[PDB]
Write a protein that binds this ligand. Structure first.
Ligand SMILES: CC(C)CCC[C@@H](C)[C@H]1CC[C@H]2[C@@H]3CC=C4C[C@@H](O)CC[C@]4(C)[C@H]3CC[C@]12C
Ligand SMILES: CC(C)CCC[C@@H](C)[C@H]1CC[C@H]2[C@@H]3CC=C4C[C@@H](O)CC[C@]4(C)[C@H]3CC[C@]12C
Ligand SMILES: CC(C)CCC[C@@H](C)[C@H]1CC[C@H]2[C@@H]3CC=C4C[C@@H](O)CC[C@]4(C)[C@H]3CC[C@]12C
Ligand SMILES: CCn1c(=O)c2c(nc(/C=C/c3ccc(OC)c(O)c3)n2C)n(CC)c1=O
Ligand SMILES: CCCCCCCC/C=C/CCCCCCCC(=O)O
Ligand SMILES: CCCCCCCC/C=C\CCCCCCCC(=O)O
Ligand SMILES: CCCCCCCC/C=C\CCCCCCCC(=O)O
Ligand SMILES: CCCCCCCC/C=C\CCCCCCCC(=O)O
Ligand SMILES: CCCCCCCC/C=C\CCCCCCCC(=O)O
Ligand SMILES: CCCCCCCC/C=C\CCCCCCCC(=O)O
Ligand SMILES: CCCCCCCC/C=C\CCCCCCCC(=O)O
Ligand SMILES: CCCCCCCC/C=C\CCCCCCCC(=O)O
Ligand SMILES: CCCCCCCC/C=C\CCCCCCCC(=O)O
Ligand SMILES: CCCCCCCC/C=C\CCCCCCCC(=O)O
Ligand SMILES: CCCCCCCC/C=C\CCCCCCCC(=O)O
Ligand SMILES: CCCCCCCC/C=C\CCCCCCCC(=O)O
Ligand SMILES: CCCCCCCC/C=C\CCCCCCCC(=O)O
Ligand SMILES: CCCCCCCC/C=C\CCCCCCCC(=O)O
Ligand SMILES: CCCCCCCC/C=C\CCCCCCCC(=O)O
Ligand SMILES: CCCCCCCC/C=C\CCCCCCCC(=O)O
Ligand SMILES: CCCCCCCC/C=C\CCCCCCCC(=O)O
Ligand SMILES: CCCCCCCC/C=C\CCCCCCCC(=O)O
Ligand SMILES: CCCCCCCC/C=C\CCCCCCCC(=O)O
Ligand SMILES: CCCCCCCC/C=C\CCCCCCCC(=O)O
Ligand SMILES: CCCCCCCC/C=C\CCCCCCCC(=O)O
Ligand SMILES: CCCCCCCC/C=C\CCCCCCCC(=O)O
Ligand SMILES: CCCCCCCC/C=C\CCCCCCCC(=O)O
Ligand SMILES: CCCCCCCC/C=C\CCCCCCCC(=O)O
Ligand code: NA
Length: 384
């Protein structure tokens, strides 16, 4: 069948993806610009990620359509249009890794997050990562390319001029670059690092939630011990365990000041050997526990759960990047590692290419479905 027929389907799908990638990610950027509640370091990387996806629609997809025709081109110009998408993919990887690390910092040392992770430092990291993404993605332009061994028969068949080649991705970009350097080193390794960071995030959240419940039970258990104690040493022993837990859980303020003071009150009575007076003093702790401590427990738990939800949302974005890009990389591995295997058919090549491009569509939906502040800002932008 005439190649223009299957090409027309491929090109139409690519153009549809480009429109959606631009519209959704412009909406992401407009939301962050407009809503100061969305202006935080995490979302600056989200914006850098949306900018990469906008450029997939504006430049990488037009470049992909162009290179699918095999048109005659100077080889190094062909190389640029082949490799620019690698810059955008690499920038996306750096942004995704930064988001994971940012969420790990927020959960693991929340007391120093705002002093460690600042807007000015985020902007510098983003700038550095874009420079590194150009260097990584355009490495073939530095000489790791097949321009030295042009396919002259294909060039002559298409009437190409001197110094020109039929511009085809796999004719100019070396497959050892794509597999060993781009895929294994620059894509697979960062994704595996992201997985490790997310495991650390979720393990830290789970452990901290367990610590909240352990301290809550320790408070209530030791109150019961005092209640059914028959001597002052037992009351003193249990209160000493309560005091260290109360101060450790303090690490509002009034509630914990009352709690520790009332523990000290009962402890002084215990040490004077006045058991009944110490047991009555310790029962007062229940009023403080009900009015203050459980409210702190529930808010801390609610904050940790919100952090889990945000980390899950970020992990979905990273996982969808892997799901959308792995098929094309895996196909490249078959092309490279199995020269006895027939090349993946053209329709599958174009399916894998369009799938990688659909990743630039999906993030705005994840934010809309998973982040109320985005979803609410999206609605206000669309309605207004
Ligand atoms: C700021 C944005 C809009 C700039 C976009 C510039 C793009 C469209 C330009 C910059 C470099 C250009 C390439 C440079 C060299 C060649 C080799 C020639 O034999 C065919 C055209 C080709 C392949 C050009 C295509 C268009 C190109 C990719
Ligand atoms: C990332 C997740 C979704 C897994 C994706 C698996 C895909 C990329 C795998 C599964 C089966 C694979 C195919 C199995 C067999 C062949 C025949 C060979 O002559 C060319 C490669 C080709 C055509 C493979 C291409 C890649 C392939 C389609
Ligand atoms: C966690 C996972 C997704 C990491 C990536 C796995 C990749 C590197 C694996 C999954 C399946 C593998 C392929 C399975 C089969 C073959 C055919 C063989 O003749 C050459 C190697 C080759 C082509 C493998 C290359 C590496 C490969 C593509
Ligand atoms: C991730 C980086 N990357 C690639 O790796 C990639 C790729 N296109 C191809 C292969 C195209 C192709 C192969 C064989 C053909 O004829 C038999 C043919 O007509 C086209 N590949 C391998 N692109 C899209 C521009 C891309 O973005
Ligand atoms: C604000 C955007 C500024 C853009 C600066 C230029 C960006 C792209 C530049 C083109 C890459 C170099 C030319 C491509 C290869 C030339 C072909 C050849 O060498 O024969
Ligand atoms: C926007 C989404 C697709 C636009 C459809 C127009 C493309 C016409 C057919 C493709 C071609 O030029 O061969
Ligand atoms: C996928 C595409 C989502 C597009 C959402 C529709 C709003 C577009 C208007 C805008 O870009 O500001
Ligand atoms: C197409 C590429 C566009 C990407 C950027 C998307 C919009 C992001 C913010 C641009 C700055 C908005 C300032 C416009 C003036 C309106 C205002 O500030 O009230
Ligand atoms: C080039 C593609 C688009 C770049 C858009 C940059 C984002 C503008 C808004 C900045 C912000 O959200 O604070
Ligand atoms: C045309 C070439 C464009 C190259 C990369 C531009 C990237 C701009 C970065 C936008 C995000 C920065 C931010 O979030 O503040
Ligand atoms: C708003 C940004 C606009 C910039 C992108 C516009 C579309 C770019 C599409 C691909 C340019 C490369 C096509 C050049 C074909 C050359 C044909 C020939 O060799 O005679
Ligand atoms: C915001 C603007 C984005 C870009 C708009 C322009 C759309 C470009 C669409 C595809 C360009 C394909 C160029 C054709 C390649 C040359 C064909 C040939 O020489 O055989
Ligand atoms: C959107 C506007 C139209 C895009 C048309 C893309 C046509 C480029 C391929 C032409 C060709 O196959 O020779
Ligand atoms: C390079 C990967 C990102 C560097 C650290 C990101 C942490 C941060 O958000 O400040
Ligand atoms: C081809 C280049 C390869 C080397 C890449 C160099 C990496 C960074 C280059 C210049 C970075 C410019 C931005 C500096 C601001 C950083 C401040 C900060 O970290 O907060
Ligand atoms: C040397 C590689 C070619 C030029 C790379 C520069 C790309 C853009 C750099 C930083 C984007 C702006 C970041 C601001 C936040
Ligand atoms: C920074 C990463 C590499 C920049 C490459 C600049 C493009 C070189 C064009 C090659 C040529 O003129 O033949
Ligand atoms: C293949 C790509 C090779 C990259 C070479 C690495 C060189 C760049 C390394 C990291 C840049 C560190 C940023 C330092 C700039 C100033 C920092 C500061 O002032 O706080
Ligand atoms: C920093 C590195 C800049 C490298 C500039 C690229 C040189 C083009 C390679 C070439 O012309 O063959
Ligand atoms: C995660 C990083 C994975 C690292 C790559 C493993 C490389 C395996 C060696 C390839 C086979 C060598 C050969 O082709 O003979
Ligand atoms: C190849 C592994 C890809 C991992 C993507 C990010 C992992 C997120 C886990 C939850
Ligand atoms: C991390 C995931 C694993 C990384 C390494 C992946 C598999 C490498 C397989 C390549 C070896 C096949 C060589 C083919 C041959 O011997 O002819
Ligand atoms: C990630 C999942 C990767 C899926 C890999 C699935 C099996 C690959 C089987 C390869 C067999 C190639 C047959 C071609 C031939 O022998 O001629
Ligand atoms: C959902 C995805 C829909 C597309 C399904 C992918 C098709 C099967 C995987 C690979 C088998 C097709 C390739 C045939 C192998 C060959 O002829 O070289
Ligand atoms: C996105 C959802 C599905 C998109 C489907 C595939 C788009 C391109 C399909 C290839 C058309 C046939 C080309 C060929 O005959 O080689
Ligand atoms: C579903 C994903 C896309 C399917 C595209 C067409 C696959 C059937 C093979 C086409 C062919 O044999 O030429
Ligand atoms: C076919 C072209 C469009 C493909 C888009 C696929 C992913 C889009 C967003 C999912 C929203 C639910
Ligand atoms: C290809 C992407 C597959 C589905 C994810 C689309 C977004 C889901 C919305 C929740
Ligand atoms: Na992306």
């Amino acid at each position: 069948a005439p190649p223009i027929m299957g090409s027309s389907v491929y090109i139409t799908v690519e153009l549809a993806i480009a429109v959606l990638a631009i519209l959704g990610n412009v909406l992401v950027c407009w939301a962050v610009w407009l809503n100061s509640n969305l202006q935080n370091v995490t979302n600056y990387f989200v914006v850098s990620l949306a900018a990469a996806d906008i450029l997939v629609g504006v430049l990488a997809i037009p470049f992909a359509i162009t290179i699918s025709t095999g048109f005659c081109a100077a080889c190094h110009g062909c190389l640029f249009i082949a490799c620019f998408v690698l810059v955008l993919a690499q920038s996306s990887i750096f942004s995704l890794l930064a988001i994971a690390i940012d969420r790990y910092i927020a959960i693991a040392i929340p007391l120093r997050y705002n002093g460690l992770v600042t807007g000015t430092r985020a902007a510098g990291i983003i700038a550095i990562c874009w420079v590194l993404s150009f260097a990584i993605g355009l490495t073939p332009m530095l000489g790791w390319n097949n321009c030295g061994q042009p396919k002259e028969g294909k060039a002559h068949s298409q009437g190409c001029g001197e110094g020109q080649v039929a511009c085809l991705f796999e004719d100019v970009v070396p497959m050892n670059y794509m597999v060993y350097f781009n895929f294994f080193a620059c894509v697979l390794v960062p994704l595996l690092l992201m997985l490790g960071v997310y495991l650390r995030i979720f393990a830290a959240a789970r452990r901290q939630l367990a610590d909240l419940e352990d301290n809550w039970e320790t408070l209530n258990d030791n109150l019961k011990v005092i209640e059914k104690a028959d001597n002052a040493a037992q009351v003193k022993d249990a209160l000493t365990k309560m005091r260290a837990a109360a101060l450790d859980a303090q690490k509002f303020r009034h509630g914990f000041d009352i709690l520790v003071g009332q523990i000290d009150d009962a402890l002084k009575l215990a040490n004077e050997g006045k058991v009944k007076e110490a047991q009555a003093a310790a029962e007062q702790l229940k009023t403080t526990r009900n009015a203050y401590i459980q409210k702190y427990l529930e808010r801390a738990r609610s904050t940790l759960q919100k952090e889990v939800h945000a980390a899950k949302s970020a992990a979905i974005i990273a996982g969808l990047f892997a799901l959308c890009w792995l098929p094309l990389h895996i196909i490249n591995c078959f092309t490279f590692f199995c020269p006895d295997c027939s090349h993946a058919p053209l329709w599958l090549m174009y399916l894998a290419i369009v799938l990688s491009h659909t990743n630039s569509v999906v993030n705005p939906f994840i934010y809309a479905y998973r982040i109320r502040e985005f979803r609410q800002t999206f609605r206000k932008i669309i309605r207004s």
